[PDB]
Amino acid sequence: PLESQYQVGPLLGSGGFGSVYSGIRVSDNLPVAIKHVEKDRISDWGERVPMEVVLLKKVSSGFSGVIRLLDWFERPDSFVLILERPEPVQDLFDFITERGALQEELARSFFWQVLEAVRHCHNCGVLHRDIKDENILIDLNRGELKLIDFGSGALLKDTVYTDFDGTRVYSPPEWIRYHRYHGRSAAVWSLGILLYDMVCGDIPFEHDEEIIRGQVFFRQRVSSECQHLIRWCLALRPSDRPTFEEIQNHPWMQDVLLPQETAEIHLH
Numbered sequence: 001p002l003e004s005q006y007q008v009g010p011l012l013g014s015g016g017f018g019s020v021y022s023g024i025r026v027s028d029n030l031p032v033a034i035k036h037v038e039k040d041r042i043s044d045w046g047e048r049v050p051m052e053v054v055l056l057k058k059v060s061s062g063f064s065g066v067i068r069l070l071d072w073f074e075r076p077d078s079f080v081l082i083l084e085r086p087e088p089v090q091d092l093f094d095f096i097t098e099r100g101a102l103q104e105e106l107a108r109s110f111f112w113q114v115l116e117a118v119r120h121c122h123n124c125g126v127l128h129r130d131i132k133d134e135n136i137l138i139d140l141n142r143g144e145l146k147l148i149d150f151g152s153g154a155l156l157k158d159t160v161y162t163d164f165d166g167t168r169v170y171s172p173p174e175w176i177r178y179h180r181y182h183g184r185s186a187a188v189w190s191l192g193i194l195l196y197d198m199v200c201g202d203i204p205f206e207h208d209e210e211i212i213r214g215q216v217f218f219r220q221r222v223s224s225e226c227q228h229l230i231r232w233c234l235a236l237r238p239s240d241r242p243t244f245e246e247i248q249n250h251p252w253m254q255d256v257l258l259p260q261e262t263a264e265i266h267l268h
């Protein structure tokens, strides 16, 4: 059974993704996250399993940048997912809420790790579709970030997407205006929103009209090179956006700290 092999803890949270509980694997006391998703709330299926599970199995590996699915169960009206849980841990949203705008050295480290994680997914045929601070977990001890919540994701394809159920304020202007986007360039856009969030302590755009206007105003002191990378990711024309390679070869991205140095300087 399920409740046999996992000691269920307190509710960590709930929302569009379902309900997440803290847990521990009974055998070896491994900290786990127990995610309950209602069958009525799932729109994407087929291996018949939720897309999220397909996606999670596809990206599973020893690479600690993407969250690992440890196991999954089916129930009459729901699926239960047992995922890795770092400890101690904080999501990027809470982390930014506490500390405000991040020092460029830390934002570089964090951003680099998100890029490696997203490249990993794309390399495995997976498009996340909801990259944002709330979907990034920080292993506070190792200084390692984890991408979570593949519940809005899809198989990566080269043709247009006309469905979207990620986060509107991280969605590109081509989704807003036309309900059409392509996977890579839409991901780059959300990465630009994310970097801005990291260095300014909040997202650049709130309303649809700001997204489509795409004018970036900096509310905090941010280096010329970081502003350039940001504005590049946030190019209105999808084809004007950098590739993942171009982002990582950007002058601002050079001399990244290791996760363990990042934790030493900034987390410990």
Ligand SMILES: O=C(O)c1cccc2c(-c3ccccc3)c(-c3ccccc3)[nH]c12
Pocket: 012, 013, 014, 017, 020, 033, 035, 067, 083, 084, 085, 089, 090, 091, 137, 148, 149, 150
């Ligand atoms: O959704 C996953 O794939 C997932 C995968 C792994 C972990 C999580 C945690 C999580 C977050 C903080 C601390 C511990 C677990 C959450 C979460 C999301 C919103 C509110 C509360 C929890 N979701 C996951």
